[PDB]
Design a protein around this ligand. Sequence first.
Ligand SMILES: O=C(O)c1cnn(Cc2ccccc2)c1
Lengths: 300, 237
Amino acid sequence: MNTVPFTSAPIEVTIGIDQYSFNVKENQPFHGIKDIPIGHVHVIHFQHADNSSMRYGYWFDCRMGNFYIQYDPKDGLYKMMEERDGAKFENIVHNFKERQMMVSYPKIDEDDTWYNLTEFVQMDKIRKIVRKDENQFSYVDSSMTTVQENELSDPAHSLNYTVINFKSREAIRPGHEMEDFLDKSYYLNTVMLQGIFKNSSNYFGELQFAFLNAMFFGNYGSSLQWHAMIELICSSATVPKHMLDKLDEILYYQIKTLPEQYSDILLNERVWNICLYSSFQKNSLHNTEKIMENKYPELL
Amino acid sequence: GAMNSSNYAELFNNDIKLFVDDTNVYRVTVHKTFEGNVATKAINGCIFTLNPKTGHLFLKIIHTSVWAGQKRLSQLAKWKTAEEVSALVRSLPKEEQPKQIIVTRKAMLDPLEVHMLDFPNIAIRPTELRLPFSAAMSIDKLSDVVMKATEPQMVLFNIYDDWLDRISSYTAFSRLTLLLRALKTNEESAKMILLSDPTITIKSYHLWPSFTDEQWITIESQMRDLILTEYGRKYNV
Ligand SMILES: O=C(O)c1cnn(Cc2ccccc2)c1
């Protein structure tokens, strides 16, 4: 088990840690989050009570170091920092007075939701999408644009998702225009899987990361990426069987976790009707189809 | 962006542009089989690609052999159109390539965009103009060359004859669209108006009769009257 110590909580805020959330009042005696389970990946996110603009947060792996949160009164946000001096960290985090002012990460043992949502998400790949090499953790917020979006304006503060564009030379072999536009298997299998991602795990990992950035930060370009990566698979007549079966599971848990009142902004009606009812792989998403129809029938 | 009547005169500026109409590419007759069923038979078609400023028409004849052994022909026809339009653009010198291609049917947008990926600075646009280019096959010399073709074939015409010697491109396009709208509304009557004086002939190298300026004024009024008469007949006005 791991701990995320907070020097203080000077401004009222809603704090999320993975799929959970709680509130802290202004100047409340709050010193962080304890009892966090097995952390291949985690995310801690913030939305200020006095200004819900800019949700922001940090992706991190407890194994890559000791991470704490301190409020910066100049930049006006809660900042993640790493401590190289382990003894000092161990000392602050094991102080029983400090531990009494920490909330316990609340893991029900039956629940496997967080590793179903983040299985293919790796910090090493996050840090290539979010380029800030001097830190072991990665900042994302509601307003950050994607490289692709920028190509249609600060490249340091961008989300470097893999560019997917169905009407581009990369997607369409000369001489196969109709074939490749109507059946995206070439683009999926040769260009993306064999060429860029190298395997389906890296593909699913970026898909899951994009979904979670869309849901936790309301990041629009992330939502576009999530849907694009779904549509590329569904619009391909030839997809490995294991990949289809795994996709149904991945999407089922994303739809299950999605806030009920957020569907008008996190789900693209066009894409989901195509994937579930018209695409080559319509009949390959049985579990996702069933949860969507019963949870969100209005979109369909 | 979409083309319409506010930015209408833009069609006749010096940026090269082409209209593409695909409505006569895939053409069929519908008849009854021996078992009593109904069957289609394809007939030759054409792509109508027109420069509205110069009158240059690139009539690509679509021979029925291109449909043989193919499925979903109405879908294929849009991709075939796009393939031939792209090939036309590639065959032109750069200074003759269009800056915009305007498609008369929005379903042509994605096929043409995909076939035109090598030309990222050529804008592909729909239009809100209702244009009557589907009646191109009511022009006798166009229909004749399409029906006679035994192989794929490109035929070049100036659809304005010599009109630009005397009127502007704007005015020529207006005359063209009036004539074609009349032929689309009441083809036999529009054909009658144009042939009613056998002493006003069509030159061997023209499509339309050699009307004087004053005769064109009369002809245009007769075509407007034909269109208005049909409107009243249709809506009981
Ligand atoms: O630098 C470290 O090692 C470290 C550990 N915890 N913190 C935040 C914190 C400081 C003081 C009291 C409570 C929390 C910083």
